[PDB]
């Protein structure tokens, strides 16, 4: 779980169709997103949210939930928030969020 492995793994999966992947792999991609969110400073979370909304064509009325996910992944301890996301969100929502994030994460300034 090095910086190099994280980036290579994110590059690989950013470009995959994950609509039909296995739950075990989808769960691991959620962990990947959580770890990668923690490579951004708090100061960049608003930009990460805005870039996510723009990429996904989401209205500003969806800013608050998108930002909350990034904030709470960033502050997560013991994977508690991450585990809640997995439990409480539907599969389609997890897929959409994960693909979005993996495609923006390497393109944005992290500090």
């Amino acid at each position: 779980i090095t910086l190099l492995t994280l980036i290579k793994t994110a590059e690989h999966w950013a470009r995959q169709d994950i609509r039909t992947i296995e739950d075990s792999k989808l769960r691991a991609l959620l962990t990947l997103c959580a770890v990668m969110t923690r490579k951004f400073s708090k100061s960049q979370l608003s930009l990460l949210c805005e870039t996510h909304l723009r990429r996904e064509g989401l209205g500003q009325d969806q800013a608050e939930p998108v930002l909350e996910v990034y904030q709470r992944l960033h502050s997560d301890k013991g994977g508690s928030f991450e585990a809640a996301l997995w439990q409480q969100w539907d599969r389609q929502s997890l897929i959409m969020f994960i693909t979005a994030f993996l495609n923006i994460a390497l393109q944005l300034p992290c500090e």
């Binding site: 989401l58 969806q62 939930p65 928030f81 969020f97």
Partner: peptide
């Protein structure tokens, strides 16, 4: 004690 995620984004 329970952890609650926000509602998922709504795509129109």
């Amino acid at each position: 004690t329970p952890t609650v995620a926000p509602p998922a984004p709504v795509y129109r």
